[PDB]
RNA sequence: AAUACGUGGGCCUUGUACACACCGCCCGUCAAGCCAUGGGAGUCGGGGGUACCUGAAGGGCGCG
């Protein structure tokens, strides 16, 4: 459950550390985004000598949600943070590593290259 | 014919920042062209220090 002005951890090896959600894409008055949803972000903090600049508007895919997500088999998963991965214009990973676990729902989001993740839960 | 003869050159000394020689040299501002370098709301880095919190391996100390 991520909305406009929510702050997310950036869970890849690109320069960004924190991001701010500008917009949830997908329709008029679409309020919330969950794992596997695409959002627009503004980069809030970077590491020194970062490829991406502070204040850069970018796209991202949500990979971890504090609010729990329901699976059709009656199971639920929730994480301790809210984390996203930045994307380029083509819709591909901007970086090369993924830090922390990612949700299993990302397999079906045509986002298979996040198989860089240490563990898919 | 008239009319009074007293008010630019040479010699000696002196100063010189001139020696094409005072029709000389020469300062400073404004304007023009290149070069280097100061101040500045801020903003971006680099490694070191202090304190705190976490904390591997391997010894020590009493499965911690």
Curated annotation (Swiss-Prot):
Q: What superkingdom does the record give?
A: Bacteria
Keywords, A to Z? Ribonucleoprotein, Ribosomal protein, RNA-binding, rRNA-binding
Q: Which residues form a coiled coil?
A: none
Q: Which GO terms describe its cellular component?
A: cytosolic large ribosomal subunit
InterPro entries from the UniProt entry: Ribosomal_uL14 (IPR000218), Ribosomal_uL14_bac-type (IPR005745), Ribosomal_uL14_CS (IPR019972), Ribosomal_uL14_sf (IPR036853)
The cross-references to SMART domains, in alphabetical order and at most eight, read: Ribosomal_L14
Q: What processes does the entry annotate via GO biological process terms?
A: translation
Q: Determine if Phosphoprotein is one of this entry's keywords.
A: no
What NCBIfam families is this protein classified in?
rplN_bact
Question: What task does this protein carry out?
Answer: Binds to 23S rRNA. Forms part of two intersubunit bridges in the 70S ribosome.
Mind telling me what this protein is named?
Large ribosomal subunit protein uL14
